[PDB]
Amino acid sequence: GSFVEMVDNLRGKSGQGYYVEMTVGSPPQTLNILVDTGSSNFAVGAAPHPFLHRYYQRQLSSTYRDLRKGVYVPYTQGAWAGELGTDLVSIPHGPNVTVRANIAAITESDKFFINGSNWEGILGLAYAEIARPDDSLEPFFDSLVKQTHVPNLFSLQLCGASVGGSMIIGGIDHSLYTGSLWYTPIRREWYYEVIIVRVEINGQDLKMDCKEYNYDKSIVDSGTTNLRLPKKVFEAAVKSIKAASSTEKFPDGFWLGEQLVCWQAGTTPWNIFPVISLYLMGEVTNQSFRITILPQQYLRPVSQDDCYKFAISQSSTGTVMGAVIMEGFYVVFDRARKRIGFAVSACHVHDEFRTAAVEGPFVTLDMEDCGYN
Ligand SMILES: Cc1ccc(Nc2cc(-c3ccccc3)ncn2)cc1NS(C)(=O)=O
Numbered sequence: 001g002s003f004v005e006m007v008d009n010l011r012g013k014s015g016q017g018y019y020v021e022m023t024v025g026s027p028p029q030t031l032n033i034l035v036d037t038g039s040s041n042f043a044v045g046a047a048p049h050p051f052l053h054r055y056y057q058r059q060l061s062s063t064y065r066d067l068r069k070g071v072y073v074p075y076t077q078g079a080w081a082g083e084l085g086t087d088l089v090s091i092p093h094g095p096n097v098t099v100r101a102n103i104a105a106i107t108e109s110d111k112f113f114i115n116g117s118n119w120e121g122i123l124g125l126a127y128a129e130i131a132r133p134d135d136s137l138e139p140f141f142d143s144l145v146k147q148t149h150v151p152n153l154f155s156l157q158l159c160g161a162s163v164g165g166s167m168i169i170g171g172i173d174h175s176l177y178t179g180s181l182w183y184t185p186i187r188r189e190w191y192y193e194v195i196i197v198r199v200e201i202n203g204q205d206l207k208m209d210c211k212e213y214n215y216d217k218s219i220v221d222s223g224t225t226n227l228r229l230p231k232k233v234f235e236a237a238v239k240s241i242k243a244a245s246s247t248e249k250f251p252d253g254f255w256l257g258e259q260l261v262c263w264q265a266g267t268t269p270w271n272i273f274p275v276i277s278l279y280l281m282g283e284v285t286n287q288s289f290r291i292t293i294l295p296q297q298y299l300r301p302v303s304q305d306d307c308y309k310f311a312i313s314q315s316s317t318g319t320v321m322g323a324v325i326m327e328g329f330y331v332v333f334d335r336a337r338k339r340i341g342f343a344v345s346a347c348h349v350h351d352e353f354r355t356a357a358v359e360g361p362f363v364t365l366d367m368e369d370c371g372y373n
Helices: 140-147 229-243
Strands: 010-012 018-024 029-036 042-045 063-073 078-088 099-110 122-125 153-158 164-169 177-185 197-202 218-220 227-230 263-264 276-281 285-293 299-302 305-310 312-315 319-321 329-334 339-345 357-363
Touching: 018 164, 029 042, 029 164, 029 229, 042 078, 063 099, 078 164, 099 140, 099 285, 177 276, 177 285, 177 329, 177 357, 197 229, 229 312, 339 357
Parallel strands: 029 122, 042 099, 218 319, 227 312
Antiparallel strands: 010 018, 010 164, 018 029, 018 078, 042 122, 063 078, 078 099, 153 164, 153 329, 177 339, 197 276, 227 319, 263 305, 276 285, 285 357, 299 305, 329 339
16 A cells, blocks of 8 residues: 555554644654544644653743744543644655644643653544634644645544554555445534444444434544443443343443452453444435444453453533544544545454454435434
């Protein structure tokens, strides 16, 4: 393949995201940078922190330009504060280009960096609408497309478990997937927003109004571990997942993520847990497709003891299709054509009985109604 050098350019630890090496400043300073399609800021640890091995030293970068403006990004677990500037940025195992991009130097943080994640910053790949302090701050990818010939497209292959995978920038590598790629529109360019039209557990329709699957939004977000489902959706999904796996009994707190369950090394009875399908709006009127994950995706390994957290959780900002979803698939963020493609990942974790799936087409009527206004 012509994109061979970008293949296997991601690393990570389970539950702690996937990062890419980015080279910042002059002379060069390389950092591990979290790939996050669920935000739009490029920020790097820029002062010492207990959880950082390395950080950005702007004083040592001859090409740093200070924008003279603070920046603050909250999350639900905590936040970070910092200072805006521009500098030279390239990706050794990404496109063969260098751009002047906005960079937020993080000077203080609260529950941002993860002890042992090996990343030292974040690359927000969503759109300028959600960027901080405001949409006037051009995101990394907007700069890249603006300043260079790189096609307005990236693709992600996230290889679950100590993890890895590929971010192909400017195109698609056919060795990363199998079967056809199926596309869903990007409803609006802010988050990577999409429309889920049906949910099945082991083939069984969850029978909820599709409006509920997308209240108040559904997004594809590589910086979130879990499949997050709106309260009402989550409850109905838990109940149906319980009903499908009833040959085994699990404590109430397992389904809530508060309790872990461990099996003896090599014995996890994957086959007693259901497959999960999400149908996505297709590109033609009344046409949909489904993506199907295995419990190998939604049960996350956390001794000769294999422990697992149930990684479908509750949300009150809509559906977040996190690493749990992405890890079954090769995901194409076709920004040029305002759409997202899914194909079966060449690296996804399965067994001899079941494999993750991308299937279509299906007939689904009145899909334009599912989205929140
Ligand atoms: C987008 C994103 C933003 C922030 C973080 N960071 C954290 C930090 C902590 C933490 C908690 C207590 C003490 C120290 C740190 N817990 C969860 N996420 C991870 C991701 N993304 S991710 C989950 O793919 O690594």
